[PDB]
Symmetry: D2
Subunit: 236 residues, 4 copies
Amino acid sequence: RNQQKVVVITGASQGIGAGLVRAYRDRNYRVVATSRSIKPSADPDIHTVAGDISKPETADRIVREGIERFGRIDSLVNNAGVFLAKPFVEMTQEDYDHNLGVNVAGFFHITQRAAAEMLKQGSGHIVSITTSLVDQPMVGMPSALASLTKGGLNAVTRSLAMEFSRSGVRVNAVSPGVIKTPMHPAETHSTLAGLHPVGRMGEIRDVVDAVLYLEHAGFITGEILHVDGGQNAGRW
Amino acid sequence: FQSMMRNQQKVVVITGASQGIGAGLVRAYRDRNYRVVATSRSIKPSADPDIHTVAGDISKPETADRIVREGIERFGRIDSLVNNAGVFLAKPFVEMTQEDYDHNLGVNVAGFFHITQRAAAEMLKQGSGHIVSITTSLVDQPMVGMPSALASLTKGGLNAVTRSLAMEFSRSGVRVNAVSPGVIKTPMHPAETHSTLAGLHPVGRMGEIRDVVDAVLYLEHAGFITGEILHVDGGQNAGRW
Amino acid sequence: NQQKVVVITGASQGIGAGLVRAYRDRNYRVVATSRSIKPSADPDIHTVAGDISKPETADRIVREGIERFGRIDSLVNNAGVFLAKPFVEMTQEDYDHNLGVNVAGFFHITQRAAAEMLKQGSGHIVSITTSLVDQPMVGMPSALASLTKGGLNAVTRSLAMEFSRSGVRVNAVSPGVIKTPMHPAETHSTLAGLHPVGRMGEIRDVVDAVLYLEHAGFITGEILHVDGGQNAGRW
Amino acid sequence: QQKVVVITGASQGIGAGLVRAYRDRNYRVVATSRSIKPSADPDIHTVAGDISKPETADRIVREGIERFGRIDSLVNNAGVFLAKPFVEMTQEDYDHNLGVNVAGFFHITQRAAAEMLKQGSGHIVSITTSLVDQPMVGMPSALASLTKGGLNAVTRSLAMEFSRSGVRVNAVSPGVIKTPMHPAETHSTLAGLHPVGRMGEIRDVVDAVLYLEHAGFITGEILHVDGGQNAGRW
């Protein structure tokens, strides 16, 4: 039990976030969980850390506090993220700074710090949560900042997979379709379902299972795994 | 009730089931309590009553018929199909013969095509199914020094039809996926070749039967995935090493 | 014999004839084939009639071309068929016909041509696939176009790698729905709508794509989509 | 009456090849770079600036609208490239790469696009890199993959967005191109980074851009001009 692997999960307060915290706990990992807003936990194997993930300082804190508490860092799930649907010509300098802060710098900084720790242990797993919009964008869903920002995460997943190829660190991505959260109003479900060839929305368990499959799949790196009800496969 | 649940278990057809990857899928499917129709050119019958064995040339329409017929006769339903039968040839393209062409077309394409047509007819009929094919990462990432035009042709075909049929069967409850392995450690790969075959992956080691098997079973239970190609390949598909 | 020589398959109708003309205009001699092709007045176009599924047709084509023109420099695989049909309905005859034209058609000539191109240390082989390979559609059931042309996209990357160090380049052009005579103006309205740009392609679009690949010496193993955006996302 | 093209990173060798090729086609050209001397040619308007700044995009577009009355085409060719282990990358490496590679595409594209949308017609092409789709062991470049990889995907995303508006959006993904930046003692090594075993020439990329410029039925396409890099492992 001081033998358990430690995962760092970002955006841990959100809907997929909690689901991931719970599932990693269920698979005998200790968790360092991080959010803008996260509150401390009863569970002595869940260490929470609150901070703005886009700030280099926050990343420094996550890992430092994680090493001090548990003795190591083995995995990282990059789940901090914002989405914005807006016509490209209408986006403002504020829309830009906000997406580049959360989706890009909030990947880059912990990923760098967590990777240092793994490289030195000769072992690890980085998984980032991306979006099927990267590979398959849609007419009627304008989100140029999502493609820019998440598409860079797909490509850097493959790049780091190569860079860390002989080091024992594996680097993967899960690209979901539209996932039912509380923050998605009940009225919007008929049309959101219709965004997927299968005609259902995703469920949190769908994505969480993909992450845990990749966590335990020791021959998989550089892989982008689509959990999107068919979205990436073709046009519906 | 538990007896009721046994006599009504999911049913998978597994092709190329005799050894290596296929024989591993049989056991893994049994471990999750599927019943199994295992086929191979020469599979011997099993002592497990929940494995039905059917010996035959998978490239013939008549074998596909039989597999499903005897499948239905013995278990009443067909839920899933793993196209695992496959041949692989390494040969410069300009030296490939008519015989090589027929052999690969037959097993890799006709093999896939007939059983898939018949299994899908049943899955459509009952409104739910899973079809998964085993392909190669040479489809998406071929390599200088590994000349295998026929594998690309035939397996590249399976990759494309996997997405095609995922769209066609979108509204029917039938999911369609592939697993695209790297070079997997099998008895048919003698020890002398292992260190060479290992450097065929960015990660510098060979794949295991367990890796490919777990990918198929993960797709099997992943009710929100269709038309997906899951590369299990030590990073081959990701980039150049 | 200074003029480069191209073999163009499915030369008779549609893209293929557009292709003969384009390559003639760039000073190539042409060996042109299809089931029904008729002899040409042009001394620089030699026609060969035959069923491209048969190894004998390929054998004729290459040897007749080496006879008249003394070499082979390029091959454009443009013979092809297409069948819209529910997968569970496809028949043995549907299977043999598609495999024969789409796959065997490609294999025999590509093999004989590639051998000539390898000995010389130079060549270009380009194949016409379809955007349904990467981007198939709900309501366009074509399992056989996918098996068939998908194998061509993949073999394109494969032979690109294999001929890598030899100076032979292998590419593919993957069109959307292209406006031939074969499509009644009844259909045009419906077919335009299978592209994000809401426009059918012209023959010019595909032909210029082939001619571009043919003069782009640093491109190999590429799939160039000429598809009004079909491959790029969901409309 | 002549079409108008904006070309970023116009002082680089690719940049200068593009300027000439578009002039050979009778376009008027707005050419920007950090340092670019004014032009003799009434038909080439140069704007000096740092493209990482939004202010610079504003100026480029309004100056082209001022001089020539329209913008038909945008070529994003500004770029930097850093080879460095991911774990050694500094705040300054980061801000630099994000500035030139992402911001340097984004603002200029947003302004040129507003103009093209108004006329109902246009072309946006961006020069990315083969490392996005085919990264290489021993070429560590996380920031290049992060920045140019966003470019590829926005390329397909804007092709869908502008789909019914008459604006085409495409990309050219080159291999290693023979440039003054690469000394001759290095060529034999860079050649080996393509399955084909040679480096590219300026004209290979330039023709690719001009081909896409004249190809009215292509949008959302990444065209790989890379000696086979994207196609497989060599």
